[PDB]
């Protein structure tokens, strides 16, 4: 889903891994509103060809 999702993303590069002063540091992240405007989500799109949604009014 989410935690199961990137757990193979870290592993994919992991098996591809075999294949005078400080203050050199800045930090960063961005979430929270990163789900609000999105205003829905389906995760896990597999090998897919066509997505249909039909409307009945």
Partner 1 sequence: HQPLIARDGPHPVEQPVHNYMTKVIDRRALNAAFSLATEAIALLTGEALDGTGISLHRQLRAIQQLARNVQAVLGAFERGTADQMLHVLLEKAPPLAL
Q: Under the rule (CB under 8 A), what is the footprint of partner 1?
A: 1, 4-5, 7-8, 11-12, 15-16, 44, 46-47
Count H helices and E strands in the chain, helices first: 1, 0
Q: Which is nearer to partner 1, 4 or 21 (CB)?
A: 4
Residue with smaller CB distance to partner 1, 48 or 53:
48
Minimum distance from residue 45 beta carbon to partner 1 (Å): 9
Answer whether 46's CB lies under 8 Å from 4's CB: no
Cα separation of 23 and 35, whole Å?
32
């Amino acid at each position: 889903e989410v935690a199961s999702h990137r757990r193979l993303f870290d592993f994919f590069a992991a098996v591809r891994s075999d294949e005078c002063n400080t203050l050199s540091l800045v930090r960063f992240l961005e979430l929270g509103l990163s789900v609000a405007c999105v205003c829905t989500k389906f995760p896990e799109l597999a090998y897919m060809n066509e997505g249909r949604v039909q409307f009945e009014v």
